[PDB]
Design an enzyme around this catalytic site. Structure first.
Site, mmCIF file in Angstrom:
data_model
loop_
_atom_site.group_PDB
_atom_site.id
_atom_site.type_symbol
_atom_site.label_atom_id
_atom_site.label_comp_id
_atom_site.label_asym_id
_atom_site.label_seq_id
_atom_site.Cartn_x
_atom_site.Cartn_y
_atom_site.Cartn_z
ATOM 1 N N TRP A 109 34.790 39.655 41.946
ATOM 2 C CA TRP A 109 34.184 39.995 40.665
ATOM 3 C C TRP A 109 32.810 39.305 40.584
ATOM 4 O O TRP A 109 32.738 38.084 40.737
ATOM 5 C CB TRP A 109 35.110 39.514 39.547
ATOM 6 C CG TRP A 109 34.670 39.854 38.173
ATOM 7 C CD1 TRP A 109 34.091 41.017 37.761
ATOM 8 C CD2 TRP A 109 34.806 39.034 37.008
ATOM 9 N NE1 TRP A 109 33.840 40.965 36.411
ATOM 10 C CE2 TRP A 109 34.272 39.760 35.923
ATOM 11 C CE3 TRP A 109 35.319 37.749 36.777
ATOM 12 C CZ2 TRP A 109 34.236 39.248 34.624
ATOM 13 C CZ3 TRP A 109 35.281 37.238 35.483
ATOM 14 C CH2 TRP A 109 34.743 37.990 34.423
ATOM 15 N N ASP A 150 42.151 31.994 39.268
ATOM 16 C CA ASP A 150 41.701 32.862 38.200
ATOM 17 C C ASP A 150 42.800 33.874 37.928
ATOM 18 O O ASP A 150 43.091 34.721 38.775
ATOM 19 C CB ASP A 150 40.405 33.581 38.582
ATOM 20 C CG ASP A 150 39.826 34.386 37.432
ATOM 21 O OD1 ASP A 150 40.430 34.414 36.343
ATOM 22 O OD2 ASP A 150 38.756 34.996 37.612
ATOM 23 N N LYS A 181 43.462 41.078 28.844
ATOM 24 C CA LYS A 181 44.054 42.327 29.294
ATOM 25 C C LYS A 181 45.521 42.450 28.880
ATOM 26 O O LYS A 181 45.946 43.514 28.435
ATOM 27 C CB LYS A 181 43.878 42.478 30.812
ATOM 28 C CG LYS A 181 42.423 42.723 31.225
ATOM 29 C CD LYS A 181 42.184 42.583 32.724
ATOM 30 C CE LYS A 181 40.680 42.555 33.072
ATOM 31 N NZ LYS A 181 40.043 41.192 32.826
HETATM 32 C C1 LIG Z 1 38.920 41.038 33.543
HETATM 33 C C2 LIG Z 1 38.796 39.738 34.311
HETATM 34 C C3 LIG Z 1 38.606 38.522 33.640
HETATM 35 C C4 LIG Z 1 38.524 38.475 32.146
HETATM 36 O O1 LIG Z 1 37.525 37.610 31.572
HETATM 37 P P1 LIG Z 1 37.602 37.259 30.028
HETATM 38 O O2 LIG Z 1 36.488 36.312 29.820
HETATM 39 O O3 LIG Z 1 38.932 36.658 29.869
HETATM 40 O O4 LIG Z 1 37.445 38.581 29.395
HETATM 41 C C5 LIG Z 1 38.489 37.321 34.353
HETATM 42 N N1 LIG Z 1 38.552 37.326 35.739
HETATM 43 C C6 LIG Z 1 38.741 38.523 36.414
HETATM 44 C C7 LIG Z 1 38.818 38.511 37.911
HETATM 45 C C8 LIG Z 1 38.860 39.730 35.712
HETATM 46 O O5 LIG Z 1 39.031 40.782 36.328
#
Ligand SMILES: *Cc1c(COP(=O)(O)O)cnc(C)c1O
Ligand SMILES: *Cc1c(COP(=O)(O)O)cnc(C)c1O
Lengths: 396, 396
Positions: free
Chosen positions: B130, B211, B246
């Protein structure tokens, strides 16, 4: 990795809070906190806020991400509160506003933005100032320096000493101003004094940074912004960190804003894109609920009217406590003239008590204030004024 | 000051989002987003969440600040979700949890904490990862390095290449693992593979950083934490950034946590004090509403039961879309075997489409995916599967 990490210093604000809880004495009085308190001694949810929250409960169909800069209407309302309805700044599209988690969040986002995109190396803060300012700027990698402010003898703004001190500030330095209701002194510049600093700032080359934590707690919403607007008229570049924590009673929902002003729309939009970058790498995007409550209230005629009166009620109760405090000390045999308290603005006031007088007030009489002698006036009520003033008079 | 500031790069995620809005074509299909979508194509508020919000509307009497680390019950529930009810980590009081504004906030707080209190100079992330991870760590002043992960031929975890690459990692480096539902590949290690990495990590001297963005989207709440818990059993030191964005559908309320694990209570408490310092200088304290919704749900038997089934319904719908997708491509004359999609986990899946195939899908057929070829499976429905697969088959 964590074996030899040095502990954080105790923190006296949390320490004061915990010592106040443990205090089994029934007549204890808390003046050391940062939040508003009503005649009953509590920090309630505003009626306007509850109504706003009910509407949201009933009409929200998604919690999908806000943009990095948050709810557009929130930004629009914030800019009108700061600059005024007819502002040219708003008309020329020179201002861009990011919704942030509280005023602190706004300061941090400002700090990261400047540290990463400008040549800014230091920030100038008042002496004394709110201790959180130093920590926030230091974390972004910015030196904090202090300018003189408080006249300890007259309980006044030492204006000559303020100018003298800031002359040490180079061009390209940030100078932090408290828009109104100075924390912790409650001492604000007059308009003439604001106009003078605005003028000095432009020729000396300072980037002004305004911290608004209590818009509406000094004289009124519009009046409390005069200082800012005086700077706004003079300057091409400006940043404002504003907070709705105190004036909407939304402390824990983290509702604030960082507003960036540049010479023109193309510049501000380009600078703002990097400010959004600084938000993306921090908390990604801001929390909706608290800011949605604010936007819902400010954009609705009925709720805004109700809210403004609630804010007015807070402002006036504080102003009644300031006077009751001075009169009660007077008629309790005060070894001192406390009339300066009445001219000071907002939540806070430097009582002018020594750290030993403060420490003694806690140990003997169960009255809690900050070591500096800052008192939260909103912590005073008609019921606890008599015993508060008896304790104070007894330590002078 | 702001005259010559360089603009931020366009950002393709917002660009994709805006190009999707402008697209006047009625059959357009969005698979490029990061949020969950239901059979109707919307991101709704969970029923459990609405019920929690109603209770809060009715019983909250103040919005006074939370502590720097947030709502205690929130932290307690988060630790049980991560480590399990009977965990020794929880029993020995080795874990301390800060409520943070989302997972991103947790990563940033982790990053600042490490950069300011440890000797950590770099973080290792998967290839691909990400893109927000890199920005967050870089802002704290940490180098990001990449380890191999994706086997482009077999659509699998290139495990031999992963080990080979991480051998370059010195002791005292951070290595970031996605607990489950890898973003963007959807490829997770098996338990045996997790146990192997846990073992390798301890002898190589890595500080593991987990994470968790999708706990409960792979197989189940407990199952998706197995990898973490395998590391937890081996290691003395550990950090976890978790998100409820989520799995509670609370994206915009910024609900996450940073959990710090150390050898013993005295160490973790001492390290955690500096982590709180890093929060104080950032956003002061975290937003209550979203985290209060989570704590209210998880600590109530009825609401939790209702919530867990809602999460299960999301997990199963995704798993039905994965299969429907593969079968629909098969019966539409797929120039390729897409059976690997069924073994991948959670919101995301690397489709294995080229950036040109992706760009063509948007221009010709109105199907939107990310340049890398990541598709959000939750954006697929029974209604849009046929036309989606026709478009895909036509570009292969
Ligand atoms: C969607 C996602 C998040 C979410 O971040 P928030 O700050 O909690 O919205 C975090 N790490 C990953 C890898 C994700 O895909
Ligand atoms: C109370 C106060 C704030 C408020 O900070 P939030 O993060 O908005 O709670 C900011 N600045 C000053 C000077 C204050 O006194």
């Amino acid at each position: 990795m964590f074996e030899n990490i040095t502990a954080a210093p105790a923190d006296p604000i949390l320490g004061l809070a915990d010592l106040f809880r443990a205090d089994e004495r029934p007549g204890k009085i808390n003046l050391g906190q940062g939040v508003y308190k009503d005649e009953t001694g509590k920090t309630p949810v505003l009626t306007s806020v509850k109504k706003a929250e009910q509407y949201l409960l009933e009409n929200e169909t998604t919690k999908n991400y806000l943009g990095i800069d948050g709810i557009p209407e929130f930004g629009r309302c914030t800019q009108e509160l700061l600059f005024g309805k007819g502002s040219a700044l708003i008309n020329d599209k020179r201002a861009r506003t990011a919704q942030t988690p509280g005023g602190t969040g706004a300061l941090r986002v400002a700090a990261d933005f400047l540290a990463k995109n400008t040549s800014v190396k230091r920030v100038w803060v008042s002496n004394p100032s709110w201790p959180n300012h130093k920590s926030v700027f230091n974390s972004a990698g910015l030196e904090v320096r202090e300018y003189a402010y408080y006249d300890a003898e007259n309980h006044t703004l030492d204006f000559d000493a303020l100018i003298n001190s800031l002359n040490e500030a180079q061009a390209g330095d940030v100078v932090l101003f408290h828009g109104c209701c100075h924390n912790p002194t409650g001492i604000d510049p007059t308009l003439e004094q604001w106009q003078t600093l605005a003028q000095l700032s432009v020729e000396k080359g300072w980037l002004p940074l305004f911290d608004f934590a209590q818009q509406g707690f000094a004289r009124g919403l519009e009046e409390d912004a005069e200082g800012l607007r005086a700077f706004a008229a003079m300057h091409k570049e400006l940043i404002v960190a504003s907070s709705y924590s105190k004036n909407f009673g939304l402390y824990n929902e983290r509702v604030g804003a960082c507003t960036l002003v540049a010479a023109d729309s193309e510049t501000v939009d380009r600078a703002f894109s990097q400010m959004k970058a600084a938000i993306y790498a921090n908390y990604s995007n801001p929390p909706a609920h608290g800011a949605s409550v604010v936007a819902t209230i400010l954009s609705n005629d009925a709720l805004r009217a109700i809210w403004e009166q609630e804010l007015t009620d807070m402002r006036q109760r504080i102003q009644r406590m300031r006077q009751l405090f001075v009169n009660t000390l007077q008629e309790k045999g005060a070894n001192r003239d406390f009339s300066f308290i009445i001219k000071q603005n907002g939540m806070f006031s430097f009582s002018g008590l020594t750290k030993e007088q403060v420490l003694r007030l806690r140990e003997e009489f169960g009255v809690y204030a900050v070591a500096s002698g800052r008192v939260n006036v909103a912590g005073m009520t008609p019921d606890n004024m008599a015993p508060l003033c008896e304790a104070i008079v007894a330590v002078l």
